Symmetry: C3
Subunit: 123 residues, 3 copies
């Protein structure tokens, strides 16, 4: 008279939900790659911006033996403020990924134990 079939669906449903949660974790990682990839493109642009500062005046002296070069800074490079703050951002993600993996591990162990107990009821 036990409703094992109803429990099997409920237990099975939890497994389905757990799988979808895992898919979100992999999807989230793909998004992180896009953001980081954009930064790499930004660094390439900074190099080119520095070149523009080098460009100042060509042939602006055909009656003098001198050339005016004005390589004024162009791209503001972040040495410590963004790096320290960005590492903190990455660090928070690392703790969340480690905490989520722990919870997923317990769920998998608990999920299998719940199904195992169900078989013992009528097996």
């Amino acid at each position: 008279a036990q409703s094992r079939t109803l429990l099997a669906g409920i237990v099975q449903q939890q497994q389905q939900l757990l799988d979808v949660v895992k898919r979100q974790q992999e999807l989230l990682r793909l998004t992180v790659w896009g953001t980081k990839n954009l930064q790499t493109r930004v660094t390439a642009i900074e190099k080119y911006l520095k070149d523009q500062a080098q460009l100042n005046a060509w042939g602006a002296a055909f009656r003098q033996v001198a050339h005016t070069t004005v390589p004024w800074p162009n791209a503001s490079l972040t040495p410590k403020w963004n790096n320290e703050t960005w590492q903190e951002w990455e660090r928070k993600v690392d703790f969340l990924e480690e905490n989520i993996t722990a919870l997923l591990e317990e769920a998998q162990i608990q999920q299998e134990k719940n199904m195992y107990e169900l078989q013992k009821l009528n097996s």
Copy 2:
């Protein structure tokens, strides 16, 4: 003597969790739009950077009938390496979205079946 009320809460709870998971999928899509939107802005900047290369020296020749134009490349355009890698990134998201939709469909069908079975117990 069956604990249908406890099961109704458990079954109902799974429905609530399923709804929240769906909300994350829509929220994830909004984040993807922001990343892609930034790239469109980056392309506009590349056009302007090319213009800076065109700027070289104006009036740098008032004793000669010539003008020095130095349009040296400025923005490094990605033709195949980033596109092929980016398509792979988008492709992975497409498979994950299709797999998540399949799991959600099964959960909805299974979720309704679990509630339907519960009514048959006392209906």
Copy 3:
């Protein structure tokens, strides 16, 4: 003869899944900060690009009492089209965060009620 132990695992499992979902919400917020942070860097670049337009020709006139300054626009600033569309993007996230918080609140209240009912069965 009630399978409270099986229910305790199922009820406990839902709590574990709820916790992981909350972790995704915090992880999603960290990703939003990275995207917004990139835009701040982009604004700094726009200021520098304007400076490049100012750079035109230095000393390109050693036989005339005039200087040619050509500060042609460089960074295309978005005043209304991107802001209005971006606010809509942020607005959608705000409604999703508010809706997810509501669902989480109901789950927590319902989750505790389900455990409370279980104790009454044998307490």
